[PDB]
Structures are given as C-alpha cells and as structure tokens.
Amino acid sequence: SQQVDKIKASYPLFLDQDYKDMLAKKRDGFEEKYPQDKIDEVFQWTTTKEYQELNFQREALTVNPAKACQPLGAVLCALGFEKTMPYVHGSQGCVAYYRSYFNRHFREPVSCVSDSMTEDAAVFGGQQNMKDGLQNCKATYKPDMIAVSTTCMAEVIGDDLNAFINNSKKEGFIPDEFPVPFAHTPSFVGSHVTGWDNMFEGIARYFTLKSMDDKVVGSNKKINIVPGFETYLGNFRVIKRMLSEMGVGYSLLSDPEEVLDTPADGQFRMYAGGTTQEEMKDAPNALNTVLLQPWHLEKTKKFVEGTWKHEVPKLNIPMGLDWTDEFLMKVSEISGQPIPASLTKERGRLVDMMTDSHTWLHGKRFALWGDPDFVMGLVKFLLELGCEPVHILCHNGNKRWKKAVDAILAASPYGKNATVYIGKDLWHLRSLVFTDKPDFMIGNSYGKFIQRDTLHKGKEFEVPLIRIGFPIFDRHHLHRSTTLGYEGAMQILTTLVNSILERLDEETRGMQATDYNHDLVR
C-alpha cells in the first residue's frame, strides 16, 4: 500500500508488514534456504584467519577485481583529443559497457563507437566492418580524428589494424589525410591503464614517427605533460593552473577536462576542447616530456625517449608534499622559470593544515586500493601525515612497483605495519580488514560492500569507506575533486581528518553513555 502524500520507494516500502510476511513466505515456501544459524556460522567463518589462508591460496578464481580491461583506457585517452571519436574495432557489447561505466562516474555523455563485428567475422575478418565503420562514423558524427582500439574478439581473430585502416583509405572509404591513429588493446593483457598507454603511444607515433627529420629538441620552449588514465577533473585543472602560474609553456597531451564537463545550456556538445593534432605533431620540439603516472606509461616513455629523444625526468606522481615539491623543482630546472610566490604560499598553507590536523591523523590505520601511481602517491602522503597505510592493494600492480612502494614504506616509521599486495582483489582485501582491522578504507565504490560486511560482524568491527579513486558511482560530483598537487593534498587531508571526526561523533553521540566525549570543539 501507499499513502499518496508520503510515497515510499523500495526502501522503506518493503519493510511494511504485508511485504515482510510475503517475503518470509517466499523464502520458507520455495527457496530451500539454509537455516539462519548456518548462514551466521558460515559468515563468521569468512571473517577468520583460517578462511583468509584458504582465500590467499586462490590461483584460478578472481573475486571482486579492482581493475578493468584495456579498451576502457584507450577510450579515455582518445577522448582527450580535439574533435576525436573513440572507435573500438570489434564487438559492440564492449562499447555499451565502456560508455555506461564512464557515464556513471562523470555523470556526462561519453561518445564512442564500435564497428559491430559478429560471429561471421571469424571466417572472413573485420576489414569490411572497418571500411564501412570509418566511413559511417566520419560522415555521421563529423569527428576530425578517429582513434581506433580493439576488443578481445578482434585480437583473437587477428585483424591487422594497420592494414585494415590503410585499405580503408586506399579504397576511398575515408580521405587519405584523415587522421586514424590506432593501437592493439587486448583485454587479456594488463588492464585499463595499459590500454591508455597503448592508445597514447599509437597517437604519438601517428603524428610524429615519419616526420622526425625537421624536429629540434627544445625548439618550442614547452614541456609536454602526459597525464595517464585520470578520472578527476581537478587533476587536469590543477596541473595546468600550476604551470600557468609559473609561466611555464606546456602541452597537456590528452586533455579531456572540457569534454567531460560541458555546460547544460540547451545544447549537447559531442566534442569540446582537447589536445590539438598540431600539439601532437609539434610535441617532439618540446624541451622534455614529463609523465605524471609513470608506472602505466612505460611504452609511451620508450617512444618519447627512443624517437623524440627527450630525457624523461625520474619523477613520482605529484601527490602529497614532497612529490609536488619535486615536480615543481624539476619543472623549474627544465623550463628556467622560478617557482613563484603564489605556489610557495600555497605549499605553506598545506603545511599549516598538516600541523593543524596532525593530532587526529596520527597513527590512523588505513586499507586502500587503486591504480599503481595513485596508490603509491596516496601511501606517500599518508606517511607524511603520520598515518599508517596497513593494507596497500594494487590488483594491477607489478613486482618492480611493489619494490618501489616497499622502499618508501621502509624509509618511514609509519610504514612499519604495512604490506603491499599485487594481483590480489577485493575479496582478498575483505579478509585483511577482518583479521587485521584498520580504522578506515580509502577506495572506490566497490568498497561499500566491504564496509557492509564488516558492520554485519558488529558495529565495533565496521570499517568505514572513504571514497577516493575510480569508479565512484554512489556519490555525486566527486569526479570534480583534485588529488594532485598541494590543492589535492589539501582536499585529501580535509576528507581524511573529517572522516575521522565524523566517525568519532557517531561513536560519542549516545546520550549518557558515550557523549561525555561529544566535544563541541575538536
């Protein structure tokens, strides 16, 4: 039933007695459910060290992964280029998923096409799909560039992207001069970040490989910035803001911040902003190329060093205090620009906030996950805050990266109780937060189910989630945030200390029981 002036959605509608009785009858009648005592027994078992040991013995089964597949990153990379249509050669179901995944994180349109290869292509290949697909895409959506990647079906069948695109131009389906950079992006290799690396390197090759003869390193007095797979609008913006404040000439290579934030003003803009083709063509003339997320830009690095002859600086992601300092000092060295008073003052405002909040942050224990560069920068900043990053999980991490993070941990007393995990998933992490309980999780929306599980054991065992990462689907507009630079460090610090204080308020809100410590001032 409903009361017209107080309509109930599913929650709390289904808590009405009649729905409750109906659901109990469905269970008892037809579901052959295990008895509640048995469910409780098995749940308790899943929180134990014994279960954790079985859990960590898994070899073949993955449960609740913390990564996606290559083409997702290729799509995000391509979206950062001016009037560029991401085009995934292969099966169309993949493209529905990439678009929806990004739709839900950015709350924005996400344009991408497929060429709709079907079972028949397993006999004759996808060449005709490429010819008609490129022609149809160009005519219908009028991009100035189509950036081609692949789904796993096309990789297994073995379609030669280079040959198919060349023949599409030869046979007149698209103009010869029309830019169609490409990359093979097999989902069974690496993860979404690898697809970003592959797509970027393909676009870089497209515009520079056969024209290096006239290039002179440093001739355009700019620094190239490669952001990698990046899903916070504030991160593209803070980098451009800081370089502009220093008077540093730069080219942000893959810049989707406009197309992922168009105004609702009465018209839909399929394309906005982005890196220009000319910026890619001119990129070898820069002083140098800086990679903001080097641990998933290894192929790009080899190309800019091997072909453009740039000496890519050895810089960590500019997260936290030390690594933002290092980023700006290296940029100052390359460019000849001093670090200006505005950034020096911003830096000292961050340090001030650290002194202001250090007593509530000190010793706080965290489990956290994400992509390798994000994760290591979060670990570094936590150490700088006097926090303990106890469970550090990077599903798509590698041994060399883990050694780097273990070195960072070993250089700080706040790393003494921390372990770095690679190849492990959120079912692994769930075990760790039961057996070695931290104070909070820093992670993406999939962490909400871990928090749910911990609360089920009891309120004293609940581990609250702090949402920093990708994807975030169950809160609105956090994709506008910043995590890089001093600005992002300030935002992270604020979110962390206030999550601590919100939870303390919750635990001290009990009248006469715990509210002796429900202080007005903290």
Partner: protein, 477 residues
Amino acid sequence: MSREEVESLIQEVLEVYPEKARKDRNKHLAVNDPAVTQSKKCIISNKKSQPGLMTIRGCAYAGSKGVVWGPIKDMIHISHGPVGCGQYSRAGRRNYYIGTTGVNAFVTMNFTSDFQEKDIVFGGDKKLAKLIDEVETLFPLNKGISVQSECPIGLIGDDIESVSKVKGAELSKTIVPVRCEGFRGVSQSLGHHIANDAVRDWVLGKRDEDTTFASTPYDVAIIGDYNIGGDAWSSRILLEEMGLRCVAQWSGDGSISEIELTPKVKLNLVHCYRSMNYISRHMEEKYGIPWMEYNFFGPTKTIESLRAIAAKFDESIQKKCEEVIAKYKPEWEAVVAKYRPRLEGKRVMLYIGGLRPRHVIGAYEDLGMEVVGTGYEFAHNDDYDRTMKEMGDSTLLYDDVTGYEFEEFVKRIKPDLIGSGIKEKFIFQKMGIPFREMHSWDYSGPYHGFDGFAIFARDMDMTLNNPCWKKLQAPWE
C-alpha cells in the same frame, strides 16, 4: 507532429549517411498507421547494427549474464574470459534480492576467470576446473554455478560443456555452461534465447521432473520479471492477495530451487515476452503448462491483467480479484488526482530494450501523457506487432536507433520528457529536456503494480516540473 512531417523528418535525418547506411536505416524507421497491423509490412528488426553509427545495443553476454542468469541469487555466476565484461556488469542492474551476500547469495559480486594471454594460448578449460574447486572451498553454501562465456571462449576452442559435465559429476553440483559469447547474434536478444536453452537443458532437464512438492490449483510462476527496484515483489503481493501462490520468480529474487519447481505450476504469467517466451513455449510443449502475457504498468493495465489472470481460475479467485481492485482503488485514484493535472498533455519519447517501450505506454496515459515516439534496441517483429496496437496514429517508431537519429528526432519533435538509458540521460539533460531512466528507474521504483504506479507518478512529476529546467539559459544569453 503530422504524418507527412514525420516522414520528412526521417528523410532529412537520413541525408547525412553514406548510401549503404541510408538504405539500411530507412528500413528501421517508420510512422505508425492504423491500417497496417503486421509489422513485417512496415519495419525491419533484429538485424545487425550498421558499423560506426553508435548503436545503444549491448551483446549476448549482457542478455545472458546481465539479464537472465545474474539475478539468480543462490548460484555463483562466473564471467569466463578477460576482466572487463564482468566488471562493467557488476551491480549495474538493480535486480533486487533478499540474501546474505558472500554467504548464501552472490548477485552483486563479480566472479571471473580473469583471462590472461596464457589462457588464450593454452586454453582456459583447466583454469575453469581449478576455479570451480576454489569456488567450492570459499563459498560452500552456493547452490549451483553458471559459466557465462565471454568473446574469447568459443573463438579459441575451449569446451566448457565438458568441464561442466566432468566437474558436476565429480562434485555433485549443478554447473551450467552458457555459450553467450558477445560475438553471437546481433544484440542482447540472442543472449536471452541462449540463456533460456541453458535453463532448459541444464536446470529443468536435470532437477525438474519428480515432485514430492504439494501442488494447489492456484500455483503460478512469474516469468520475465527481474525485480528492478523491487518490481517483482510489488507484483507478487497482488497476485497472492488475489488467491494465487507464486511458486517461482524468473529471475528477479529467484532461487534455483523455485526455478526447478516451475514445471509443477498451473499457469506461467509472462511479463517480459521478449526474454522468456522461449522457455514458456518449452514448458507448454513438454509439461502442458499454459502461459499468458500480462502488464503491471499503471492501474488500467494492472486491473486488466488481474481480471484476465483470475479468469483462468475459478469463482473464488475471481471474487478475490475484485476484492484486490476495490482495495487499491482509493490509492491509485489519489495518485491520479494529484499527479495527472501536473502531467496531462505532456509528450514523451521512449527508447528502451525489448518490452518497456510498449509496456509502459498505458501508465503514461493513466497520467494524461502522450507517447509520441518509441523504439527498441533489440525487439523482433512480434514485439513491433504488439507495439503498433499500443501506440497512437502517426507516431514515430525506431528500431536500433542510432545516437545521431535519436538526437535529431528529439530536436524536431521537442518532447517534454524522454525515457531511456544511462548512455542517453546526460545528452538530453544538457538540451534542457527532462529525462527519466527507464531501465534503472533512476535509482527509484518499483514501478510495477499499484504501489509502483505511485512511485512512477511521483518520479515523472518531480523531474518534468523541476525548477532546474527553467534555468538553462543565462539571462544575458
């Protein structure tokens, strides 16, 4: 708009296409005509999508794993292949259930074989068998396993049927191989059919032909309700208030045991004809169970359905049917009295999958609204036949609409409201057109039944009449 205006719009939009695509798309766009009732005389459907045109369709894995199998709550469903498909479809569809997740229910979890290149080179059958053992060790209360094949599985020559047969016999477990690779078919639709055949061959054919269950003459199953936001629960309650016993729900909040009891019911009640007509026809042929289509969207259809269902039983059920209608009459009448004046006259365009583009029209009409265009991602001609009966004269019909067509149709027709999916939502909001998601219910619902109509009306009103829509143009332009 006028018939002649709509035909002119179609031709104008199609001018942008290369000739091959223009000729194809023309076949998938039509203007409804009362004189033409057979859709195979006016629109083509269930054909491949044209490359590069930004279809809204998904794949057969979406229709099998995402739609049919994934909701079954006490089984573990393995996304077998590389990591993407299973991650993008993790918990995106609001197929609601009651359970203790990770312990006796598994719906919002992502179990995957996470294929690496070594698995392409050597095959994944050995990995699959080891994975099944690991599932049994860590999730002992699971009541069955399904194997949802992603694109690579068939292409590399793996034999998941042999693995399922061998491991099932070794472990005494129901293990269901499903060849729903996304390269098969042209959309989600073939995934439905593949998934229905897997239920037939591996679940009903393996645990559904000897009773010990206590039957009654009022036993029914809800076929094709995936309980989006609780839709199936807000339907079940009415059927049982009418005196029926809902033995099973396929597949929303569905247990494997209730599915296996279904060959014992007296009547299959089909909501989503597209996705489960196949198994319904099978159960009639093999068990003699009749099936009938019904519609629980809005009071008019819900009342008609309850009466039509009750007429298949006896006088006691028909008496209880009229009791249910009398109970809820003041409730839905209050909803209409409040919301119909706030919505009457407004024009709606819909684009959804295989059922709702026609099934929700009555509910819109119960609020005085007019559906001026509708279409489907993956419907067949039998669906279009049913649609022309529900849609008005001269309305626009589009099959497998392209992104460009949909934008251009909207710009000309200027509907007051659009009901479609997540890939469409943010486009039309930027254009200043109120939008409601008609897959996920925009995180609201249920919309089925009498309790769902209240929520539907609240939702259409909050969005159509919201103050945000008068604010898109700056006063200085």
